[PDB]
Amino acid sequence: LYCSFCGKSQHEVRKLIAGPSVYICDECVDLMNDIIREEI
Amino acid sequence: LYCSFCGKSQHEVRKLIAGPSVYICDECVDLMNDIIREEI
Ligand SMILES: [Zn+2]
Ligand SMILES: [Zn+2]
């Protein structure tokens, strides 16, 4: 199991969410959050 | 353009992010955030 956004595996990250087919880890969610909130 | 997670269109949401092929809107990012932070 790997993150469909950054490729990291189930082990390399804290949590891995299940999507329609994809996989989003906690790191990419934090990132998408910054992207959307337009903040760093 | 639609959100690969909730199907809403480019117009129905505030922002639409571009992924490797998918599209994640602000609403689904907030959701994924709750899922990961395990909070409501
Ligand atoms: Zn990731
Ligand atoms: Zn969505």
Side-chain angles (χ1 to χ4, degrees), chain A residues 1-9 12-13 15-20 22-36 38 40, chain B residues 1-9 12-13 15-20 22-36 38 40:
Chain A
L1 295 187
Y2 309 72
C3 179
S4 302
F5 293 64
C6 75
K8 290 199 178 179
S9 68
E12 308 185 67
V13 303
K15 190 181 298 297
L16 199 68
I17 300 178
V22 312
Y23 284 111
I24 314 78
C25 77
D26 44 292
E27 279 166 44
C28 291
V29 176
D30 284 311
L31 167 45
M32 286 182 290
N33 189 289
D34 292 341
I35 299 181
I36 274 168
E38 292 198 297
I40 327 166
Chain B
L1 295 187
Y2 309 72
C3 179
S4 302
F5 293 64
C6 75
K8 290 199 178 179
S9 68
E12 308 185 67
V13 303
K15 190 181 298 297
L16 199 68
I17 300 178
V22 312
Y23 284 111
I24 314 78
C25 77
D26 44 292
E27 279 166 44
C28 291
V29 176
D30 284 311
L31 167 45
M32 286 182 290
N33 189 289
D34 292 341
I35 299 181
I36 274 168
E38 292 198 297
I40 327 166

